[PDB]
Structure formats: C-alpha cells, structure tokens
Amino acid sequence: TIFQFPQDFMWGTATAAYQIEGAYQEDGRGLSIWDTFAHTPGKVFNGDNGNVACDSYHRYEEDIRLMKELGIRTYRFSVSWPRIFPNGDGEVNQKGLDYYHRVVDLLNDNGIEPFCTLYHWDLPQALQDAGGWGNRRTIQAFVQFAETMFREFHGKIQHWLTFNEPWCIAFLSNMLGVHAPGLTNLQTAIDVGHHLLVAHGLSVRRFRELGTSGQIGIAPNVSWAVPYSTSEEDKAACARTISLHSDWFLQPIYQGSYPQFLVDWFAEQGATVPIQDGDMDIIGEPIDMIGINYYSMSVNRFNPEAGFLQSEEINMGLPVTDIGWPVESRGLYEVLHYLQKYGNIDIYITENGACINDEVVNGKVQDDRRISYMQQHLVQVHRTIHDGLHVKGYMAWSLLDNFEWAEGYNMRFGMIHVDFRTQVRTPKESYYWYRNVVSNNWLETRR
Amino acid sequence: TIFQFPQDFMWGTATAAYQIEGAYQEDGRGLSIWDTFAHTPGKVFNGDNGNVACDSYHRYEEDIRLMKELGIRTYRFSVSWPRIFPNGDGEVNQKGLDYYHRVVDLLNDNGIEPFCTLYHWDLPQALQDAGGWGNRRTIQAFVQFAETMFREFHGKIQHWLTFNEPWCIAFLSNMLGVHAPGLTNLQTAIDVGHHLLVAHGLSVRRFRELGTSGQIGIAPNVSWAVPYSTSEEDKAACARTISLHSDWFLQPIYQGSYPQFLVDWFAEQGATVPIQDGDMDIIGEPIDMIGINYYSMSVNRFNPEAGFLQSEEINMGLPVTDIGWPVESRGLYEVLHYLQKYGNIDIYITENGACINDEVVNGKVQDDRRISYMQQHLVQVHRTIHDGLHVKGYMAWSLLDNFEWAEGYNMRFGMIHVDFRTQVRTPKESYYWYRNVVSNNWLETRR
Amino acid sequence: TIFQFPQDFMWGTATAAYQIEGAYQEDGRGLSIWDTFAHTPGKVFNGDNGNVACDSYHRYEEDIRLMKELGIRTYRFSVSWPRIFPNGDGEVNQKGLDYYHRVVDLLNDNGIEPFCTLYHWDLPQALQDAGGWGNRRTIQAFVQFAETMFREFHGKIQHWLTFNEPWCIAFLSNMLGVHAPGLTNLQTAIDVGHHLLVAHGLSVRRFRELGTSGQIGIAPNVSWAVPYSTSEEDKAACARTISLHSDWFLQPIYQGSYPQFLVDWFAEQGATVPIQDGDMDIIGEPIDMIGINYYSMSVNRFNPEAGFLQSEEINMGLPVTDIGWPVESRGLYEVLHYLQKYGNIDIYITENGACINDEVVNGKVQDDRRISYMQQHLVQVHRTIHDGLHVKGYMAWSLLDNFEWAEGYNMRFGMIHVDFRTQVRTPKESYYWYRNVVSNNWLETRR
Amino acid sequence: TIFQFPQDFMWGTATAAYQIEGAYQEDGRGLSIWDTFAHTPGKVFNGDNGNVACDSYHRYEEDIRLMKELGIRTYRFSVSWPRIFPNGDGEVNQKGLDYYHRVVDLLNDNGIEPFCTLYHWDLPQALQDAGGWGNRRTIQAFVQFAETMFREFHGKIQHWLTFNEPWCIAFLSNMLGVHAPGLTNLQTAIDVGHHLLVAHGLSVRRFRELGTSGQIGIAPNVSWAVPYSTSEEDKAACARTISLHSDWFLQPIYQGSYPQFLVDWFAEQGATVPIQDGDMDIIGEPIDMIGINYYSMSVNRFNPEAGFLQSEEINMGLPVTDIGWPVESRGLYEVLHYLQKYGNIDIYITENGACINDEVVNGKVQDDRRISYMQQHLVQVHRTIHDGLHVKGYMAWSLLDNFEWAEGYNMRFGMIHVDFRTQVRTPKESYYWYRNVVSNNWLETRR
C-alpha cells in the first residue's frame, strides 16, 4: 500500500541537550538536576551519566551533515538551561548562547528548520536547591530563560516548545522518583505540574509581546490505555491513565480547568493543586500547536494496588522492543482522534521511535525492527491526516543513540549508531529507509 | 500476567479429513471435489494433493497417543463423506464407517471427546457432476450422510458441527474459484450458501428427531475488518466484509433472514438467493452452540475496484505469519463481542493458529512465533470469558502439519511437525508449551 | 580453449547518464521524463530514482581512474539532454557542456576513446509536456541537441550513437507503460518509433554536413526467440518478437521500409505508421556501424493472449540471473548471423552483461556468475569474428552498479560494486578477470 | 509453465548389473571383462570395482520399495551375463536365473514393468579370452544367452533391449581403451561393432520365433555436436561425431547399410567392416522401438589432431556437472528430431541424468542442480511429444548412486544417495521432486 504524505509535511528527528551534548563542565555550564541525579549511585543504570554522551557539543557539524543527507526538513533539539543561566537566575553565559548560535546557523545554512524545546528536563541544580518547580520563583527564572532565547534567536527559530513531557517532569520525577529530582510525593508532583503550566503560559505571553517569529506550543508525552474488561471500573482506570499524561496539562491550556475527576481522585489522596487567582487565566494562553510524544499503548484494568492511579497494565503477550514496550501503533491513531476534544488543533509528532539495540555487524546496523516499528506508526499518521486531522509533521526519536535517562546508554533509540567508545557515527539501515521516505514524501508497505 | 481458565474449559486441536488422511483410494473411498481440484494443474501450489497427506488413515493411533500426552480434552476432526457414501447418494461403505469407529473408540478410550465436523469440504465428485451444492438434491444426499453418522455414532460423539466455514464453501470456492470446485459466479456461490444452510437446518432436525446424543452447531470462519478512515463508505465496506463471513449464515440461523444490505448489494450485481417457501423456517432450527474459526484481522477501505465487495485491505505494516497474515489478536475479542448480537450463545473457538514454517533443527522445532501467536489469542479468550461471554473451549489449528488446501504442504500450521518424506512426527516447541497450558488450565505472560 | 581476439578489437564498459550521474538539479539541469517517472509512486521499485545514483557527476575522475586500470580502450556513456538544453528547445547550458568536456578530456588524456550515446532515454520533461516523441517538433529539438554536441565535441569523440534501444523508447515506454513516459497506446508507440527514426536520419545528415569526426550509428536492443514447436504459428510468433526489436528500426535504415508483416500486424490492431513524404528517404541515411545490446534469448510459442505480439515465452527451466533472465549465449551468435541480412555491417556489442547481486564480503565481491556469463558471451563474439563477421568491439554493461530503471538500485550489473550508502567503489572479481582478458586480448576457458 | 505429459507416458529409473549388484563371486557368478578391468591397477579411478557396489544382489527389495514410493511405472535394469552363463557358453546357472526371478516378481508384484537390458557391458571373461566380440563365436554365445532369458522370462518382461550403448562397447572400449576390455585398435572396435549388430539382429529373430511377449529394441548412447564455425569442415567433423554414436548402428538396423562417409573415413585409416554375406540382412531385422541415452551436447570444430574423428570439442564456458559435462538440454530436442530420418519410430529415453555429488547434510541431500538438470530435459521431452514425435517414456539415470565405470564411486548419478560405507539409502531431494512429476504426470517450471 502506498501512503502519499502532504506536500508540506514536516519530516524530522529529535534529540535533547543532556542526552547528546558532550561537555557538561565546559564553557561555564552549570550543573542540572540530571547531572546530580546521574552522579548519585543507584539512580541510573550502571552509573551512566551525560558527562560525555554523544559529544554533540563538539560533533554537531557532522551530525548536521548526516541529517542533511537524510533529506530531513526540521531538527528538534533542546536548549541546556544551565549553559545559558549557569545558576538558573543570574547573568547570561554568552558561551552558552554562542554554541546554540553555531548549531542553529548551521541548521539554517542547510535548509533544516530548528524546532526548539526550551525545557527538556535540565533544571539548574541551583534552582532545585531552592525547591525547583515546587518554588514559584522558578517560574520567573524560566520566563527569563525563555525571553533570553526568544530575543537571541528571534529570526532564526520558527518553531518553539516550552516543555517536553510535563507528565514526566512532574509525576515520573516527583511522585515516582524515577527521574530527576527523584522525589516521591504526590503534592510535590502536583505543585511541579501546576508551576510548569504557569511558567508555560507566561512564556507564551512573552513570546507574543516580544513579537518573536514562528509558532509556540507544548509537547506532552501521550498515553493510551484500553480497558481489559467492559466494566466501568476498568474504564475509569484507563481514563485516569490517559488523562494524567495529556488532559491534566491540556485542559488547563485549552479549557481553563484541570480534569475534575482527577482533581477529586487526588483530593482523595489528600493533595490539592496550588492554584492562585489569575493562574488558570495565564495557563489558558492561546498556543499555535502542540507536539505529541508517542511510543506505546496498553490494556489496563482497575487494581487498587496498582500505584497511585490504581490502574494495572496487562501483559497481553504482544512483541516488545528492547526496552520492553509492546508495539501497537493503533494507539497513535486513537489518541490523535481523542485529542480532537480540544479542536482540530495543529499537531506534530515530536517523538516516536523504538529501543532496538542492534549494533554494527559488517559495517552496518541491520535494525529491521526499527524500520518495522516506524513504518507501522507512519501508516497511522497518514491515516489521521486522511481523516482530516491537522497532523503537521513527524520527528523520529532519535537522531542518535544517546543517554536514555535512567537506562543510560544501554537502550538505543537512534537511527544513527554511536559507538560511545569512539564517538563514531554509523547510520543504521533505518536511516537509509527513512531517507527514502522523507525524500520521496510517500511510504509503501509491501510483503 | 496469570490468566486462569474455567474448570470445565475444553482444550483441543483440530484437523480435517482430506488434509491429514493418508489413503484417498483405499477401502473404496470415492473421489471428492478436492481430489479433482488438487489433481488439476494450476489449482494447488506445486501440484500437491491429499493422496497421502499425513497418512492419518494409517497413523491415527500414534497421533492419538501424541494428543493424549498433550493433556487435551477434545479432538476436532472431519468425516470424509466419500468414504461413507463413495458416490454421495448410494449404499453405505462399512469400511469407511469402521475407520471412524477405530478413531472414535481410541479417542474415547483415551478420555478425549470427539468433536465431529460432518462437512469439511470433501463433496463426493459424483454429486458435483450433478451440480453439487448448486443442486438441491445434494441437500438430501447430505441429510442421509448426516443421519448415517448420527445413528452409527450415537453414544460415542457428543459434539457435532454440520459445516466448517460456509463462507469458503460458497464464496471462496464458487465466486473466487480459489477452492474446489473452483467456480467464479456469484449466483452459484449464493446458491451453494443457501443450500448448505437448508442442509444444515434439516440435519439439526434429524439430530433432534433421532434423539442423538450431545449437541450440534455450525462452525463459520469469522472475519473482522476495521475502517481505515472514519467515512461511512469505509464503514460500509467493513460491514460487508464482516457480515458475509458470519452474519450471512448466522442471521438466517438465528434471526430467520439474510442481511438485507448484503441482499441488496448482491441484487445490484444481479444475484438473488434461491429461497423457496419454508426454507427460512428450516434454516432457523435451534442449534446448541457455534464454533468460530479465527486467524486474522484487517483494516479496510471502500474501493470500487476491490473485488465483488469493493472493500480493500490496507497493508498496515504489521508483522505477518509465513502465509502472510498479520497477527492482531484483538480481532478475536472484537468479533466475539460482535456476535453477542445473536445472544450470549455458546461458542467454541474451533480453529485458531498460525502458519510458522520452522522445521526440525537439532531434534526440535523452535517455533517461538507459534507460541507467541497462541499466547496472544488465548489472552483474548480469557478476556471474553471474563466479560461473561460463553466461550466454552479452544481448538488449536492444527494437530499436525498438513495439506493446506491451495497452498499444499508448503504452509505449516501444526503443533506437531510431520516430515512428509518419512511421515515422522516431531512435536514442536509449541506442543510442549500448549501441554503446560491445557494441563495447568492457566496461562502466564512474562517478559 | 584459447580464444585470441583481433589486434584492434575494441574493449569497453558502458553507462548511461541518468543511471550514474549524481546531481539531477545541479548546474541548471532540467527534469527528464525519467525524473518525473521515478518521482511517481508505483513506477519504480521502492521509489528509487536517479537523484544521486552513483554521483558520477562528481566522482567521474575516480571512475576514469578505475577504468584506466581495467586496461580498457573505449567508454560508452550517454549525454544528459536536459543538462545541455534544460528545456529541450531553448538556450544551451554551458555548465552542462563543461561537465562532458571534463569527462571527455579526462578519457582522452587516459587513452580511452569516448563512445557517445546522444539519446539514452532522458527526454526533457518540457518536450514531453508538448507530447514528446509523439510530436514532430521533438525531432527538431533533437537535431539541435545533436548539432550542439557534434560541434562542441568535434575532434574529441570519434564514435557516436544517436539512439540507445529504440524498442524500449517506443514500445516498452509507450505501449507497455513500463518505462518513462509510461504510456500504453500502440499508435503512440508507433509514432514515437517513427519520429525517433526521422530524428536519427536527420542527425546523421547533420553529422556528415558538419564534417564531424569519427563514425555514427544507432544501438538497438536485440531480441532472439526460437520456436517451441515446429509450427508455422510458433515460427511467426518468433518472427514478430525478433523483428520488432531490430528489423522494425533496421529495415527502414538499411532497406527503406518497415517490415510489412509487422505493418500488417499493427494495421490489424488499427495502428498505422505516421509516414510523411520524404521520411523513409531521410531514415535511409547511410550509417557507419551499429551497436547491438544483447542479454538474453527465449523459446516462444504463439499465444493469442500473450500480449500485443501474441508470442508467449516458455520457462524452459534454464538457470537465470538475479533479475530473472535465462543465460543462453548462443542467441548472440544467432542474432549476429541473422543481422547479416543488412550486409556484413560493422557491429559493436555496446551492451552485454548480467544482473548478479553479490555484495562485498571480506573486502571483495565474489561474482563468479558474472565472470561465467561474460566468458560465455565472449566465446560467441570470437566465434562470429571467426565466421568473418565484422564485430568490432564489446562493452560490458555496466562499469558500475547503478540505477536499473524500473528496478531501481536492487538489480546490480556492475563490474564495480557501488555502496549507494557511501558511494564507495569496490571493483568486483569480474573486474580483475575482465582486466586480464582486455589486456591480454585473448580469453581462455578452462575446467 | 505447465507441461502436461501423455496419459500413458512411461516414467522410470535405470541401473546396470555390474554398477549396482553387490556380489561378484556369489552363487557361481563368473568374472566379466569389467571385473578384470576394474581389478587392473590404473584402469579405474582409485582402484574402485563392482565387487560390492550397492549390494543390490541382496538389497533389491528395499530398492523396489523405494522405487514403488517414487510412483514410477518401469524399471530399467540389466542382466549379468556371467551369472547366467558363468563361462558365456556352457551350462545355465539356475541361481543366476533365480535372482532375476526374485527381482522381476517383486517388480511385477508392485506394478512396475521390467525394462530389461540383456547386454550392459559385462561380457564373460571366458569369451574375452577367446577374443570377445572380435570373435563371431561370441555372437552365438549371445543368442543363446538371449534365448535363455526370452524363454525364462516370457510373460514377466514386456520390454527388452539387446545392447546398451554400442558406441561405448565398440569404440570407447576397443579404440580408446577407456572401458573394458581396454583395447586401442580401430579395426577391433569396428569388428566389435559389426558383431554386436549381427548378435542384435539374430536375437530379435529368436525373440520373434519364440513368440516372446512384449517389444524389443536397442539402446544407443546419442551424441549431438553443433559446428563452431559455418565451414564445411567443421560441419563434417560434427557429422562424424554424431553419426558414429547413432547412425553407425542405426542405419544398418533401419536402412541396411553403414554410413558411407564414415565407411570411407575408416578406410582412409585402413580399417574395414568385416561384413559377411547375409549380415546386413540379419542386422535389418525389424525392431519395435529404440532407447536413447542422452546426457550432453557439444560445439565442435575440425582438428586433424583431435583424435581418430578429427573433431575437437570447444569449451564454450557453459556450466558443467560434477563429472564435467556441460548441461545444454536442447541437444535432446535436436537429436530426437534428427533421428526422424529413420521414421517416427518409438523412442524411450532410457538414460538421462547428471553427476551431482552432493552428500547427506542434516539428513537430506539437497541436490538442486539435479532437479534443475532434469527439469530442463523433461521440457525438451514434452516439446518433442508436442511436435508429434513418438517419445514413449523417460528413465532417470540413476536410481542409486553406483559404480560409474572408470570413475568408480566418485561420480554420483543417483536420485537415491548410497553411503557405500554403510549401504544406507537416502532418497535425495530430486527423488521427491521426481515423485511429484511422475505421479502428477505433469511438470511445472517456476521462478
């Protein structure tokens, strides 16, 4: 089957700063909460950290040459906050700015549109010392950071996201302790989520007041759960699972309120959203688009023991990736249709890919399972576009094998293999497959 | 996840006569339309036929010993019609009967309940010469055959199916020409479907009048199609695809009428169901259960060029079996819930498995993909049971690698490998996996 | 057996422009009908195109160094028309000319005689928009192109071909829709064939009037079919098959008329050659030699269903190449003797080789099957030379693995492996074998 | 392509006595000239002999069971002369007769028609001591042998051949010294050829006079040579090559004279046929059919140094079998049409196969090259049948890997592998392929 994409469909790949950039102490970079986390025994697999990662602080020109041969039109990257404000608050670091000017100018020289993520999880440790996103002062530190980038990069970047994956920043990091800063306290997690949303709406204001170029949105990770039985309780469990990832952030943005059922759920557990007067109005600032990060889908049942959402995922026997996620691409189709509750808004798939850990054998990385995964999810993209939904582009997660957070370097997501021993880049067989798709601008499934 | 099945859940495997029985000219067996078909150049891959197949005419004792070690409770098999009535009409062949007495007695000796399929596609060629199922005389020949088996096997068989896969018998065989008798004429296909349904209802009558033991139903193959877009036309295409396999036979049985939209569809193509007065009443004869044959699921779109149903299947990029079918087990869950339109009727999964063509390597057949397939579909079975649906058992398709109709021996479905060179049986790794499941009577999915 | 070739025998390799040149938008190159074709979903395998191909636009020096180590005396290449006349009609592009000056000067510097093909299938899309070879205006556009090259390259090129494979240009492209422009209309195919023949004779005139250096001919692909039975109808079917490839173009050239039996055949199908007064005289312009392109041979029988020539090829069970062609080299011997009907004309084998898809393993490409194929066909060449036929040289198809038209890059013909990932060249084992043959100027078959 | 054979086409396999029978001293068997030859250092590769061969003297029942599973209709075998007349002349050995009665009765029990070759090269050494076929007394010894077999096996054998491969018996054995008795003298070779022809015609007389059942003919090996150039001298060389194998024996039989050109040729070399009055009349005895033994084809040129026929074979570069013969199946088609010079006589292909030396790997012999060879030659058979030639059956050379004369056991021809270490039989993959062809009675070539 041949799937022809729209003429102006935006193909890309995506990275984040702390996962790829190879120089954590260089040019006066301050420490993030993730340097701290990764440097703590027991937090990250094998004690891996992003000290060197892909050395993309130094090897960005080769990566841009590689993503130019790809035939790609955008590149999503994040900005290291503590490179720009090494304390989070104080005086700007021009060296930090200069690096991103070197990157962006190169991208722009090569006809690749920067898609910039301001916040991808590297909060300056200095601000964490003051309570991080639990402290409202961090909202102001963020708006300053945002302003600085809006003004510095005015005509160079046309696509902006405030926050990558608010669910992770708040709940995975502060309720589940899995990600930096590694806390396990519901109220803290809810504080963090509320404050990043205020920070978000205030940064969109600044963007509009400064007349910055391009468009600006936010990029939630998106969950999809489908009930094991037909019971109302299994249905409720799935509603909780879905809504906390997306609706909990998107309904304040789009509709001026938090999901009441989840508000009530957390009240049961004795936690309340720290909403001040004027907050919901600020959060409701009109945004131009959103990014959607999608990897996986699940079948869940109510289970009072199954975590703070009491929603257990069923091992259905599906084939999983090397990180252990079942591949079921329909979840993308389903969640995109779900999100039509906020209107036929502009949506970019700002992350989608697979942990497939193949390595270089006879000069190539024969990652057929990555081609398979991608091909399945691109069919769902074409499908939604042909349902008339405004899905505007797709960024493959992961240009490069990189530092996969609590997994370390063990879990490979890249279309380009990186030997962390040598820093040598080997474009995988998916790379050349993707090159074809993004250059032809149609996909074909064959037997 | 541990899936505990009901105490009295019925585990099995399934075969058909012409696919496994090794002796097509033996003991006065007449020719079926499938001997004829398989003996015609171009009809079956490689000119394979069931002349020898698995030689189960001779090796049934070893197979019954193997399925006894399996820990299984039923065995679904079909009866070769032209063994019993070598012309279809005339005098009974006692040698034919004796063979099935040898098989049944053995099964019953071993605590395995026979699940008998009267018609699994081997129409006596003699009756085909007279027009086969297009001729109503064949209805009478069938009722006679049915009676003979009901009376001969009275207390020995407690589970009976009239017809296996009416959609194939009628449409695949007479409209698409893919199966014997290999015709391509809608009206003939509709005649055949109508007449097998009258034959079915008349045979259930006889069953009740003779006070035969056990329960009697029919075993349709079941299709499930889900629309590519949200359009009414794609929806309509999927309704046609689903309904012709199941509703077209089940709605006459359960509700006394053919699906009107499909009636109208075929009228458009100039074909009409040859319904005589009294026919629909006969077809509405109460049955005790149905079997459901499920392998696969599809995403379809309306396409006026896509065959007589104008319903095109989309290659979605999913992993396929070795015969080329995507595995998506949810379709089983979905179609079982669909069929609740006829009531919470008793349902056996009388076929489900996968073509996985692994062969013997170092004394074993490491058919991990078959274990994977089966495990996924058994979760769907537990799931429906726990939705309160009366799903009563599960027969794995295929005890043995066998003669896969127009594929010949190329496509292996068995849990026991058969080297057709030697007739040697090698239980595959799925066999020992299934042994565990059916003996423990619970399944576990693990990573 | 030792086969000694003539002292002044001309050994070569061959490429075409769109198959190898790596820069389809570069230096004001206009689009050909093959860019268009290859950019259309479904036309070429895997959506491959010649956008980059072997990048021979940039890597020609390395290729010329490689073909210099080969010990070769000519190089057949084609000229990209839309590089010279980016619209087909308008003003010359000097950058296009300069490239071929860079190539030719290099060749001439290295003692390798250019063998130039003016037309190898890349009609400017602009002219196709006006009807392409169906339009007589394209005849004039072509003569202009030809002139430009004759005058630019006067003393540098001594060997010229107007058209490569007229049968493909006309019938494969316009009747069978397989090649650009992908039409399926007999009359159009016949128009195209007639107009390229007028274009051809007019270009030979110009060549003579301008006093251009060297010799000029045309290079048909040559078919050879041998009848399955001894019937007149099978014989007739083979006559049609053979004659449409060669005689249909060669008999106008050499004898001033089209093959009447094929004229009558096409009249039956309602198509007529658009012959204007003076046309056949123009086409009969004396030419200095022809090239012959030979790959394969077939056994055919009359079959009224077997396409517009009603000539079915029999699968005889012969070993095939990786593109699926039987190797039977006698067909070369046979067709060279056949063509003696036009006189003992000068003939170059301007293409012969095999799709053998071996890749680099331990630093070499062990393409023994290519050595085998070549060795068999070179025996046939020596054989005809020793029958006193004026066979003047041999060009191996394919210097380089390249863009094999509707096959894309899947089908490798090269004596030098190209990794299209890297553009790395690895001379195959046939390269070093050919080096020996062309340098010793004799071949030896051994067991 | 599907090739349907005639309903009553005769499929078989073939062996000879000394090549397979495992018991050279057993039951009073006298020595043949091949025991003698094989027991002489330097005559046979590796000093192999037929002392044990396949032990088919003892294992014939298993072989007949194997050729029964094949689905075959005839079996060609030879009779060991010195088993029946251990001196050639004297008193019959009943134990010898009994063995062949055990073999024939078994065959006939299994519905396999014996196709009996009286002479397959094992002349009693005793007669060789008296000059063998150079002595006319051996003609009488032979007629006696023939009678004995005609009378003993009257109603049991319906298909008889006097001599297998007269060219070998005479010229290969007595001119070229390659086969027993290993002489190199033209005149002797011509004597042998003339005397075996008188022996042949006299034996056909006896056959008719005794009213023996069935039909009787002779089975020449058949050569086909095609000239390298178009010269008369190359043509003449090929005529000599072809005619000595077939015409030299067939023209006395069918036309009452030896090929004059070959008569003159040998007269030049000072040799004359020892023709007595009445001889040519005896040789012209009407025969019912012939067998044709075909393996290979060649391209030859005149060369005054190229042996006693001055006809050199050109190594054309074609792929060869493991004994080093090029496979070119058209030679079968060509020679069958050639032989129509004797009328549309009944012809059986009483030998055709390939030396392919594959061995047992993982329990099978993957002899794809043998399937390939056979498939090509069976197409030629269908082809001639469909040209209306009376080709009546086909016997594959070789049921079993066996003693390949001067090659010993090194060169395997069998469709059943024999481990001469163990005498274990392993039917090769060609066996199961042939089983399909001979049982369906049609062949299919596929890609």
PDB file of N, CA and C in Angstrom, chain C residues 1 15 58 62 209:
ATOM      1  N   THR C   1      40.061 -23.881 -23.747  1.00  0.00           N
ATOM      2  CA  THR C   1      40.172 -23.362 -25.155  1.00  0.00           C
ATOM      3  C   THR C   1      40.596 -21.894 -25.094  1.00  0.00           C
ATOM      4  N   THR C  15      27.839   2.969 -19.584  1.00  0.00           N
ATOM      5  CA  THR C  15      26.895   3.545 -18.629  1.00  0.00           C
ATOM      6  C   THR C  15      25.884   4.384 -19.409  1.00  0.00           C
ATOM      7  N   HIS C  58      30.069  13.970  -9.915  1.00  0.00           N
ATOM      8  CA  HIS C  58      31.154  14.420  -9.049  1.00  0.00           C
ATOM      9  C   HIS C  58      32.332  13.455  -8.948  1.00  0.00           C
ATOM     10  N   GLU C  62      37.493   9.362 -10.463  1.00  0.00           N
ATOM     11  CA  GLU C  62      37.840   8.105  -9.804  1.00  0.00           C
ATOM     12  C   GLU C  62      37.418   6.927 -10.670  1.00  0.00           C
ATOM     13  N   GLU C 209      27.237  16.767 -42.824  1.00  0.00           N
ATOM     14  CA  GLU C 209      27.285  18.127 -43.352  1.00  0.00           C
ATOM     15  C   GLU C 209      28.274  18.988 -42.565  1.00  0.00           C
TER      16      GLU C 209
END
